[PDB]
Every structure is written in C-alpha cells, then in structure tokens.
Design a protein around this ligand. Sequence first.
Ligand SMILES: NC(=O)[C@H]1CCCN(C(=O)Cc2cc(C(F)(F)F)ccc2Cl)C1
Ligand SMILES: [Zn+2]
Length: 139
Amino acid sequence: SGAIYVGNYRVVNRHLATHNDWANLVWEDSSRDLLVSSTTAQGCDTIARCDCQTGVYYCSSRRKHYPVSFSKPSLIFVEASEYYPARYQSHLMLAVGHSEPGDCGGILRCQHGVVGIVSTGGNGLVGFADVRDLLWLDE
Ligand SMILES: NC(=O)[C@H]1CCCN(C(=O)Cc2cc(C(F)(F)F)ccc2Cl)C1
Ligand SMILES: [Zn+2]
C-alpha cells in the first residue's frame, strides 16, 4: 500500500483505490495502473520533473529504502493477476530489486522529487508507474 500526496491530490495504484477514492475521482487510467483522487488537506510531496534513471524506492516487505537504476517509461507486458488480465502496461519502469504484491504504492524518488510508485514485481525485479509526465499534479 501507499500513496503520493501532492497539493490537493492523492495518487494511488488504481487496483488499490478505495470507495472514497472513486467517490472523489479526479483521473484514472487502467493501462497505467494509476488513479488520482481529491483531498481536503494539502500534501507535502513534490513531483520530480526530470529524466533521472537512478533513485531510491521504499520496500514495505523489508522496511527499507533501496537505491536502484531503472529503465525509461515504456510499454511492458504484465502477466494476469487477480487485478488485471494479461496486458501491456504503459509508462512502466523496471529495476532489479526486491518486491512482493503488497509493496505496491511504495514511492520511488530522485534528487528532484517523487518519480513514481511501485506497481509490478518479479523474481528480483520491481516495476514503477511513472508520474513525471502528469504536469497537472503541480496546479
Ligand atoms: N500493475 C499490475 O498489473 C500489478 C497488479 C497487482 C499484481 N501485480 C504484480 O506484479 C504483483 C507482484 C508480484 C510479485 C511476485 F511475483 F513476487 F509475486 C512481486 C511484486 C508484485 Cl507488485 C501486477
Ligand atoms: Zn530527477
């Protein structure tokens, strides 16, 4: 679990969105595994606006933050799960790192701010949904 809190927005994995998130919906995209809802309180996270390919992510299954090198956002095949059929997920970045299903939502960040959140994983791989192109999160 986990979210990004920027301005009056809450960014979460679409597959983990709550009823309150759907009842206060701003934008959602199944192909990216992202959903954004509105908040009453102002958040403290800032979004990175850069092309970094190194950063640090939070891994809840180890209670640790790990440095990682990650690929550029791209269209990647994701196997069927209890949340989606087998499909291509867009704006996804991969890295070598530990992850488990419940790690979704952990923040990936660089020197400029938040880059994205954990969305997929494998045997020693972790995948992040990029948010750097969502310029409207800043206003
Ligand atoms: N974005 C999606 O389509 C995800 C929806 C939730 C399911 N999903 C995953 O990747 C779940 C996952 C599996 C492993 C495993 F192989 F070890 F078991 C590690 C990490 C994760 Cl995040 C895909
Ligand atoms: Zn950066």
